[PDB]
Every structure is written in C-alpha cells, then in structure tokens.
Design a protein around this nucleic acid. Structure first.
Lengths: 117, 63
RNA sequence: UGGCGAAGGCGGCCCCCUGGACAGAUACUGACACUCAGAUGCGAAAGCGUGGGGAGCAAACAGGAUUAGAUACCCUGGUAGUCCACGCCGUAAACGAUGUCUACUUGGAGGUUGUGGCCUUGAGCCGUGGCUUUCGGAGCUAACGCGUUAAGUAGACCGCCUGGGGAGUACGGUCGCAAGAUUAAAACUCAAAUGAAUUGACGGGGGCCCGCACAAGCGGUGGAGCAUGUGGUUUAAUUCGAUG
C-alpha cells in the first residue's frame, strides 16, 4: 500500500446497479464496491440503500490506503446518487468537491429503440 | 459542481446544480431514441395544452 | 404553435457558389396577366444498381425469457439497411385529409421580420408593410366546426366524385433492373356502406368517494364423527319445486 490522503470517489449510478470506485487523484483504482456485490440482488440492487452499503464497504476498504479527503464524481441517473455521497460523509471522509460526471452527448449516437412493453 | 464550503448543504446544492444543467432530464431523453415525429407531436400537444390552459385560466364564480 | 423553402424538406461553426422573399425610394415597361388537358421537372422513408464506408442503431436471423402456444411484445446478440458518390424508383395519414389566382366582408390577444415618425424627452410610444399563431362575430355548415391565413360573399381556370363489397383488383398499354408504379374494368353480390352528433353501457382510461371491501384483529369452514340439505347413483317408487 502507498498511503494516500487526497482521493476521488467515482459513483456510477446506473438504473440497475451502483458502483463506487475510490481512486487516487490520478484515477488509479484503490477500492471498489457495488450494490450487486454488497449483498443485494435483482430488485434491491436498484435501491438507494444497496448503493449506500457499496459506498460503506468501499469506504472501510479505502482506509487501508489511509484516505481522508475525497472529491465525489457522481455519474448517472440511478437511485444510488445521493445515498452513496451521504455514506462517504458519514464514514469520516471529508468531501471537498461533489462533481457530476454524467456523459451527455451533444447529439451523437442513436439511442436504443423505445421499449414497447 | 459544488465545492463543499457542511456536507448536507453541499449535497442539496449539488442536487440543485445538476437540476439546472438538466442532467437527469437529458439522460432520460437519451435512454431510448425518440422518433422525430413523436418529438414534434409531444411538443405541439405541449404548446396546445399550455395555451388551452392560459386561455380558460383567464376565463377563470364557483360560489 | 421561431425561421426558411413550391412541396418533399432544412439545425454546430467557418468559407465558397447560389435561389427566393421582404421593405424603402425613385425611375422604368405598358396588360407583358390568371389558370392549365397533354407535357416536363422536383418529390419523405423504405427499396434497387454500381463503388465506397460502417461508430451507433437495427428488418432478417440466433439464443434467453413470458405463454396453453409466443413464428410477438421483453432481454442478450445481430445482418441488410441506416452514411457517402452517381443513378434508378415516384410512392406516403406526401395532411390543413382544405387546388391555384383575384376582390370584398365586424373584432380581441400574440409571435416574427422590415420601414417611417416622435422627444431616444428614459429601454418606449404611435404609424406603415410582409409572414405567422390563437380566440371569436356575421355568415356558412348535417353537425363537428370554419370564421379577413374562410369552410363567408363572388369571379377565372384546373383536378376530382356519383351506393357498399368485388377493386385500385383483372386484362391491355406505358414506365421500371426489379420491387412495383400508373392508366383502369366486369361478372357477381349486398340493402346497405357511411358522416357528425345524442343517450346509455363498457374500458386492463382519468379524477373523486363509500361498504367488515381490503388492511388491522378475533373466531371459524376446508380435515374427524355425526346432523341436515343438494347432486349423483341406486330404486318398483326414492314425489314436485328451488341452481352463481
């Protein structure tokens, strides 16, 4: 382990799962945790609370590297946007900046077809 | 983007900083391809409803 | 419910080539106009040919689910196609389901693009044009509605209709590489087909409400043995009726 104190939390909140990848500021991965690896499956992955746990699990694995300050980059529309960020505050970590990093095409590729469900 | 200058404020300020860049709005637009005809149909009915509101909401006794 | 274009259609930014519209001002020509059978041209998307290109998407197709089945909807993939060049095709609910041109006939509120004036005495206000949106008057209309952008009042010319099926089909011609387009019947058959609006009922439409309706509880039935009724079967007869 290289001990780092300043880092970046990259919350990837899909509508299905939520991934949390705490990195150094140079974007090398240190820890990751996912709603659908932190216990919850099918329906319950896609809940705030599953993502919270992902964040918690990742947080208490990020302390091995001795991280202290994180910037949160919240990327996507999922339920695990807000909850993960709370779970980083309420796990010690000082949050410096909360960026949104959602990829927005400036008209680009034709999305998949509409679901005639 | 929100520099945390308490966190609880900062996350609310974050949540309103991404409302205002219509970020979640935009993702939901671009999840599935709206066929151009359907886009226009929605936009007309929008304008049409908005007017047909205001018009009768100027015609707006009750008791 | 901004703009431009005949329509189809056209969306980053920059340049080059280029069409149209509009306004102001003065001068010009002197009815040179309007409409148009036939003809010609342009004409979404798909499709077709040849050659490229191919991120994403996705007919077909494959697999996974769902289901009674699922040649579907859903999921994972995925090819033609989608893109470019040059042709072809000529069709769409190509729609305002509303031919073009002209004149006339109450208003209200907007948008947009010119132009003039005022004191720009302070973003403005008032005139005057073009285009466009909406609401309504008379009138019109079967009604719904249309209503100076008419579906009002008239004129010019063109296109087109003549009960529903058969059928925009057959045959013939023309056109096309093909797909097919275009022109376009008849036998036979039916006494209707149809428009708008009305009242209901219904909707796996919306809103709002109520009941031991559900929820919350409590005790049952379903299981046992008996009682009782019914069905069935049996019987000479198991009288007849009551059946969500």
């Amino acid at each position: 382990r290289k001990q780092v104190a300043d880092g970046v939390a990259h919350i990837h909140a899909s509508f299905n799962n939520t991934i949390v990848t705490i990195t150094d500021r140079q974007g090398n991965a240190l820890a990751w945790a996912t709603a659908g690896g932190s216990g919850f499956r099918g329906s319950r992955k896609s809940t705030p609370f599953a993502a919270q746990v992902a964040a918690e699990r990742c947080a208490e694995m990020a302390k091995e590297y001795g991280l202290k300050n994180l910037e949160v980059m919240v990327k996507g529309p999922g339920p695990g946007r807000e909850s993960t960020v709370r779970a980083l505050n309420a796990a010690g970590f000082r949050i410096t900046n909360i960026v949104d990093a959602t990829p927005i095409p400036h008209n680009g590729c034709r999305p998949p077809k509409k679901r005639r469900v | 983007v929100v520099k945390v200058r308490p966190f609880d404020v900062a996350l609310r300020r974050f949540k309103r900083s991404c409302e205002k860049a219509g970020i979640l709005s935009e993702v939901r637009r671009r999840e599935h391809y709206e066929k151009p005809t359907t886009v226009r149909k929605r936009a007309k009915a929008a304008a049409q409803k908005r007017h047909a509101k205001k018009l009768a909401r100027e015609n707006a006794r009750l008791y």
